[PDB]
């Protein structure tokens, strides 16, 4: 066309190549959204740090960016829409205290049924497992006073209790997991799944747990893409 | 004392002097009709006068 | 050239050379491919989803099968009726060279495309941590170009296209000359490699899926309908592709290589060989008919959607 | 104390409602029924600006009338020339989460904001080339939803903490603050005189704030959900508000009434953005249904429908010259309709 037009076209081509290279570089990582409460101990899990707080870690072959939102009111329905493409939502909930446990259940059911998060899977960390075991084994703060349905409920016969765990501890753990998974499955159409886990705040396997769960999520996404067509 | 601030704001808002709904509608209609001839979106301009042509 | 001696007998037209075979297979394949294309068009109208390279490959496959059937069956049925005649229509070696080119094109495209699709599925299953759709279309175009380039070889030498039994189709000759054996071996080798790669990749994918499923879920965390359906799809693909295409490739590779030459020096071909070739081409042709059924229609979601 | 204040507020609200009802001597529909409706409007894509690798969240035209800045989740502010399809600048972002972008009238400055809560102002006219952080505005307690350039030295920005702030670029300090919203301020529109601006929030209401005085001159309500976006009529006495109720309510300033409401049974999702034509006759509104609707501002009828994009249509805008309309969706593709 002309000299100015040629220069503009060359600049545009260089810019497009730069954007393509940056996208190729940045598409190999995974993004996760961290959620919970004040007492959930969100920052404790994944003991690595290599408004918005971003954490980076690198399991055997992949790198994860965990994004946490701070200084936000209860009206999460607005900014949550931003994270409609994250690979997973790491929902950390304190499993020791029972007074606020129902509030956590309500928060989880609100997150699960969100309009913009109908495809994002949830990795649930039932934190403070040691505190829960100590409280239940101490013969105090009965769960029945906060959960009438807990009574007359027994652990499934075809179950795998942790080695050395007392029957009461495993019973309480399974009750909590069952409540969360029931809320997960009642409204679930199979598009997204909830993965529960029991952390201890002194465990180094949380990163590997996230890695395995994200791998499974991606595999299921690929299988759905193949089959539905 | 947020109640006092709310009361003051309400009084200030009510201090306005509305003229007429019909007058506002007529003014809007007149403004729309005045510029009706300068609306390329409303009236498709000639292809020779359209910068996005190819 | 391009025409070889042959003459049908009385009983042959009634049982083996009857025209109902071509019409039946062509109509069934066309209807199945039309239904598959309708389903794919509906899915596309739903929206091009992420990692849609598989959708691109599937669309290319169904389109190739549909075009191949619609092109070849028309000529075959017309010749069966009495509209075309190799001794009267295009007597100057004009018409069925195109028929051989298109036949090779549409016989090679499905195999290579299936191999590519199997490779994509293997990558997406065994190694999840790996990734536009332009690349898929580029690959489809490259596959079609390779198939056509192989098909055009006899035009510039080596190969030879001739009208074969029952005098209704025109295909590569099973001669003992250097060019004939070279082209036959090349075609059979590429077909066998495509089938083998598809089978191997699908087997590895099915093994990985079985390891994932049989692997204890601990808490029954997942209903594995999706993994079971994929395993069934892959097993069907493997069995159908192999059992349908391998015999023809083996036959065309074996016929060219024989101590007593198959085709006599005068150009005559034994009736047994002609009948075997016709039967093997029919069983191979059924691959295209069953392809959309295995890939698309034999799906729980698609069957449920088409139920009402 | 509290009871007396509540009674006074109730009395003031009742008096305001009575005055509003009295001023409602007629309806715009009755006046406009005598106007011949505009025929069907059919607009086809002319430019398909592509290159963004993530979901586009904002857009804003420029005074040059062929210029628009787009921001996405990949963390890039891309300045496009509408006439051609050649990118002019591709500024990178410190934070990949950006929700608001704004183009200064002079074209020498641009503004960006998002979940980081810190607004970044970049100077396009670099003395030695390259674009970097020309200024950083901080002090808000929430994510920034919208921002506009009153001039080359003053910038108004609305945050999710239920507040708006006028900042001086040269001083980099909060020269003024506006408060009173009960919900997050998700919208903001500047009047032609750049003196009074109407802002909406999650409180399902809008408020008119005067820049010089910084007082809530008027407050309008009626929406049943949050107001996602707001546009100001060119004349200077009316505006339009789009909410999640699948309704678009056009109000008035002098009348102090909800002049009209646009809704249809077929449309059920919320409206992401609103815009006005050069004369204001046509109202543009993008919907979550992946479409855009052109309504007749004086007939309450869906004049036209623009179909495009494979994902949510988020940002909308109309060039000052009024020759084209830009729309950006989560498909990662802007588009220009004419
Ligand atoms: C149910 C679906 C899969 C069947 C599709 C292929 C069918 C239509 C094919 C396969 C076997 C075929 C038959 C096989 C043999 C004969 C004998 C003679 O009369 C010629 C035609 C006739 C009668 C064929 C008609 C077509 C046929 C019935
Ligand atoms: C996509 C599908 C339909 C395949 C289409 C391939 C077309 C282009 C092929 C099929 C048959 C081919 C022809 C077959 C034979 C000859 C005779 C030769 O002396 C010149 C080339 C010519 C005339 C070929 C031209 C290209 C041709 C028409
Ligand atoms: C200790 C060793 C044997 C364990 C590893 C093999 C385990 C996982 C077993 C269980 C299920 C098996 C698969 C089941 C089905 C098939 C399909 C068949 O056409 C090829 C073999 C293949 C693909 C099997 C390979 C081996 C397999 C994957
Ligand atoms: C999925 C597997 C089972 C393949 C599907 C079955 C196909 C290949 C079957 C169904 C009908 C069959 C044909 C039915 C009748 C005849 C006539 C006979 O004189 C030669 C074989 C021939 C021409 C058969 C070839 C194989 C055939 C086409
Ligand atoms: C190596 C060839 C691959 C072909 C794949 C293609 O997808 C199949 C086409 C078949 C054709 C085979 C040609 C001749 C077979 C004999 C026909 C006859 O004489 O009745 C026609 C009869 O079924 C259809 C149409």
PDB file of N, CA and C in Angstrom, chain D residues 165-196:
ATOM      1  N   UNK D 165     -15.092   7.784  43.359  1.00  0.00           N
ATOM      2  CA  UNK D 165     -13.998   8.671  43.723  1.00  0.00           C
ATOM      3  C   UNK D 165     -13.528   9.448  42.506  1.00  0.00           C
ATOM      4  N   UNK D 166     -13.377  10.759  42.675  1.00  0.00           N
ATOM      5  CA  UNK D 166     -12.757  11.621  41.681  1.00  0.00           C
ATOM      6  C   UNK D 166     -11.321  11.879  42.121  1.00  0.00           C
ATOM      7  N   UNK D 167     -10.373  11.505  41.264  1.00  0.00           N
ATOM      8  CA  UNK D 167      -8.948  11.582  41.540  1.00  0.00           C
ATOM      9  C   UNK D 167      -8.301  12.578  40.590  1.00  0.00           C
ATOM     10  N   UNK D 168      -7.288  13.283  41.085  1.00  0.00           N
ATOM     11  CA  UNK D 168      -6.485  14.178  40.263  1.00  0.00           C
ATOM     12  C   UNK D 168      -5.244  13.427  39.794  1.00  0.00           C
ATOM     13  N   UNK D 169      -5.081  13.315  38.474  1.00  0.00           N
ATOM     14  CA  UNK D 169      -3.971  12.539  37.926  1.00  0.00           C
ATOM     15  C   UNK D 169      -2.640  13.165  38.325  1.00  0.00           C
ATOM     16  N   UNK D 170      -2.533  14.489  38.203  1.00  0.00           N
ATOM     17  CA  UNK D 170      -1.278  15.159  38.531  1.00  0.00           C
ATOM     18  C   UNK D 170      -0.929  14.987  40.005  1.00  0.00           C
ATOM     19  N   UNK D 171      -1.916  15.139  40.890  1.00  0.00           N
ATOM     20  CA  UNK D 171      -1.658  15.017  42.320  1.00  0.00           C
ATOM     21  C   UNK D 171      -1.703  13.570  42.791  1.00  0.00           C
ATOM     22  N   UNK D 172      -2.457  12.717  42.104  1.00  0.00           N
ATOM     23  CA  UNK D 172      -2.578  11.331  42.527  1.00  0.00           C
ATOM     24  C   UNK D 172      -3.216  11.176  43.890  1.00  0.00           C
ATOM     25  N   UNK D 173      -4.224  11.993  44.188  1.00  0.00           N
ATOM     26  CA  UNK D 173      -4.926  11.946  45.461  1.00  0.00           C
ATOM     27  C   UNK D 173      -6.426  12.032  45.218  1.00  0.00           C
ATOM     28  N   UNK D 174      -7.194  11.503  46.167  1.00  0.00           N
ATOM     29  CA  UNK D 174      -8.646  11.472  46.045  1.00  0.00           C
ATOM     30  C   UNK D 174      -9.226  12.863  46.263  1.00  0.00           C
ATOM     31  N   UNK D 175      -9.322  13.653  45.191  1.00  0.00           N
ATOM     32  CA  UNK D 175      -9.818  15.016  45.327  1.00  0.00           C
ATOM     33  C   UNK D 175     -11.280  15.065  45.752  1.00  0.00           C
ATOM     34  N   UNK D 176     -12.054  14.009  45.504  1.00  0.00           N
ATOM     35  CA  UNK D 176     -13.438  14.003  45.962  1.00  0.00           C
ATOM     36  C   UNK D 176     -13.923  12.567  46.098  1.00  0.00           C
ATOM     37  N   UNK D 177     -14.887  12.365  46.997  1.00  0.00           N
ATOM     38  CA  UNK D 177     -15.488  11.060  47.233  1.00  0.00           C
ATOM     39  C   UNK D 177     -17.003  11.190  47.284  1.00  0.00           C
ATOM     40  N   UNK D 178     -17.694  10.246  46.647  1.00  0.00           N
ATOM     41  CA  UNK D 178     -19.148  10.172  46.652  1.00  0.00           C
ATOM     42  C   UNK D 178     -19.572   8.849  47.272  1.00  0.00           C
ATOM     43  N   UNK D 179     -20.473   8.921  48.250  1.00  0.00           N
ATOM     44  CA  UNK D 179     -20.959   7.744  48.953  1.00  0.00           C
ATOM     45  C   UNK D 179     -22.466   7.856  49.133  1.00  0.00           C
ATOM     46  N   UNK D 180     -23.098   6.711  49.374  1.00  0.00           N
ATOM     47  CA  UNK D 180     -24.536   6.660  49.552  1.00  0.00           C
ATOM     48  C   UNK D 180     -25.153   5.402  48.976  1.00  0.00           C
ATOM     49  N   UNK D 181     -24.438   4.749  48.066  1.00  0.00           N
ATOM     50  CA  UNK D 181     -24.916   3.495  47.500  1.00  0.00           C
ATOM     51  C   UNK D 181     -24.911   2.401  48.560  1.00  0.00           C
ATOM     52  N   UNK D 182     -25.960   1.578  48.555  1.00  0.00           N
ATOM     53  CA  UNK D 182     -26.032   0.438  49.456  1.00  0.00           C
ATOM     54  C   UNK D 182     -25.393  -0.814  48.873  1.00  0.00           C
ATOM     55  N   UNK D 183     -25.323  -0.921  47.542  1.00  0.00           N
ATOM     56  CA  UNK D 183     -24.707  -2.049  46.883  1.00  0.00           C
ATOM     57  C   UNK D 183     -23.502  -1.613  46.062  1.00  0.00           C
ATOM     58  N   UNK D 184     -22.816  -2.606  45.502  1.00  0.00           N
ATOM     59  CA  UNK D 184     -21.629  -2.331  44.703  1.00  0.00           C
ATOM     60  C   UNK D 184     -21.998  -1.501  43.481  1.00  0.00           C
ATOM     61  N   UNK D 185     -21.207  -0.462  43.218  1.00  0.00           N
ATOM     62  CA  UNK D 185     -21.445   0.434  42.086  1.00  0.00           C
ATOM     63  C   UNK D 185     -20.895  -0.259  40.843  1.00  0.00           C
ATOM     64  N   UNK D 186     -21.790  -0.751  39.989  1.00  0.00           N
ATOM     65  CA  UNK D 186     -21.411  -1.518  38.810  1.00  0.00           C
ATOM     66  C   UNK D 186     -21.507  -0.721  37.516  1.00  0.00           C
ATOM     67  N   UNK D 187     -21.887   0.553  37.576  1.00  0.00           N
ATOM     68  CA  UNK D 187     -22.086   1.332  36.364  1.00  0.00           C
ATOM     69  C   UNK D 187     -21.807   2.801  36.643  1.00  0.00           C
ATOM     70  N   UNK D 188     -21.522   3.537  35.570  1.00  0.00           N
ATOM     71  CA  UNK D 188     -21.270   4.970  35.654  1.00  0.00           C
ATOM     72  C   UNK D 188     -21.259   5.580  34.258  1.00  0.00           C
ATOM     73  N   UNK D 189     -21.928   6.720  34.089  1.00  0.00           N
ATOM     74  CA  UNK D 189     -22.016   7.387  32.798  1.00  0.00           C
ATOM     75  C   UNK D 189     -21.812   8.881  32.985  1.00  0.00           C
ATOM     76  N   UNK D 190     -21.076   9.492  32.061  1.00  0.00           N
ATOM     77  CA  UNK D 190     -20.745  10.908  32.127  1.00  0.00           C
ATOM     78  C   UNK D 190     -21.647  11.708  31.197  1.00  0.00           C
ATOM     79  N   UNK D 191     -22.142  12.836  31.697  1.00  0.00           N
ATOM     80  CA  UNK D 191     -22.960  13.721  30.889  1.00  0.00           C
ATOM     81  C   UNK D 191     -22.089  14.478  29.889  1.00  0.00           C
ATOM     82  N   UNK D 192     -22.694  15.026  28.831  1.00  0.00           N
ATOM     83  CA  UNK D 192     -21.887  15.771  27.849  1.00  0.00           C
ATOM     84  C   UNK D 192     -21.102  16.914  28.467  1.00  0.00           C
ATOM     85  N   UNK D 193     -21.663  17.585  29.472  1.00  0.00           N
ATOM     86  CA  UNK D 193     -20.974  18.683  30.137  1.00  0.00           C
ATOM     87  C   UNK D 193     -19.939  18.207  31.150  1.00  0.00           C
ATOM     88  N   UNK D 194     -19.901  16.910  31.456  1.00  0.00           N
ATOM     89  CA  UNK D 194     -18.947  16.361  32.421  1.00  0.00           C
ATOM     90  C   UNK D 194     -19.059  17.070  33.769  1.00  0.00           C
ATOM     91  N   UNK D 195     -20.290  17.351  34.186  1.00  0.00           N
ATOM     92  CA  UNK D 195     -20.563  18.010  35.457  1.00  0.00           C
ATOM     93  C   UNK D 195     -21.460  17.192  36.371  1.00  0.00           C
ATOM     94  N   UNK D 196     -22.479  16.534  35.826  1.00  0.00           N
ATOM     95  CA  UNK D 196     -23.359  15.654  36.581  1.00  0.00           C
ATOM     96  C   UNK D 196     -23.341  14.272  35.945  1.00  0.00           C
TER      97      UNK D 196
END
